[PDB]
UniProtKB/Swiss-Prot annotation:
Belongs to the Nudix hydrolase family. Changing F25A: Reduces 2-oxo-dATPase and 8-oxo-dGTPase activities. This is Oxidized purine nucleoside triphosphate hydrolase. Widely expressed with highest expression in thymus, testis, embryo and proliferating blood lymphocytes. Changing G35F: Loss of activity. Its cofactor is Mg(2+). Oxidized purine nucleoside triphosphate hydrolase which is a prominent sanitizer of the oxidized nucleotide pool. Catalyzes the hydrolysis of 2-oxo-dATP (2-hydroxy-dATP) into 2-oxo-dAMP. Also has a significant hydrolase activity toward 2-oxo-ATP, 8-oxo-dGTP and 8-oxo-dATP. Through the hydrolysis of oxidized purine nucleoside triphosphates, prevents their incorporation into DNA and the subsequent transversions A:T to C:G and G:C to T:A. Also catalyzes the hydrolysis of methylated purine nucleoside triphosphate preventing their integration into DNA. 8-oxo-dGMP binds at T6, K21, N31, W115, P116, D117, D118. 8-oxo-ATP binds at F25, F33, G34, G35, K36, E50, E54, W115, P116, D117, D118.
């Protein structure tokens, strides 16, 4: 069994918009925008939906930048995380109950305040490289093992319900 998720990085020439989880799981960490793809929606519509809900932003285009798989100890569920980035946004960023957007200069990324896997694949995203990655987690804060690879084109999964 896997669970289908999206993550969207709003990435501009000198800056990246992250959001601070205000409540819930992972509260107090900065991350990209996204969440679970629900039944009855496509991955890309779920990505657009979560970004609109969490930041109030609309996007003209999303670029498929990567795939990450998360495995946890104790959970048979795997997470299939489809990563996107976008340069072209409209609206002004405003917080939801769940998330508060804030801009960071690209050399000021707060990796100590983000999830540990971000230290690995965020550099590739910031180099405009496409990637596949896998991270085996223990609890919240501990990567047990991982693999990461750059790729030329990204990985179509052909989800036929999404
Ligand atoms: Zn489904
Ligand atoms: Zn992009
Ligand atoms: Zn997938």
């Amino acid at each position: 069994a896997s669970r289908l998720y999206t993550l969207v990085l709003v990435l501009q020439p000198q800056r990246v918009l992250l959001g601070m989880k205000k409540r819930g799981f992972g509260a107090g960490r900065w991350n990209g925008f996204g969440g679970k793809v629900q039944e009855g929606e496509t991955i890309e519509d779920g990505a657009r939906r979560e970004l609109q809900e969490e930041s109030g932003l609309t996007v003209d285009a999303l670029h498929k930048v990567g795939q990450i798989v998360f495995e946890f100890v104790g959970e048979p569920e795997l997470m299939d995380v489809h990563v996107f980035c976008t340069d072209s946004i409209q609206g002004t960023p405003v917080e939801s109950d769940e998330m508060r957007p804030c801009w960071f200069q690209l050399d000021q990324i707060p990796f100590k305040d983000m999830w540990p896997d971000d230290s690995y694949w965020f550099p590739l995203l910031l180099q405009k490289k496409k990637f596949h990655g896998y991270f085996k987690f223990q609890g919240q804060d501990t990567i047990l093992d991982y693999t990461l690879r750059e790729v030329d084109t990204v990985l179509e999964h052909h989800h036929h319900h999404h």
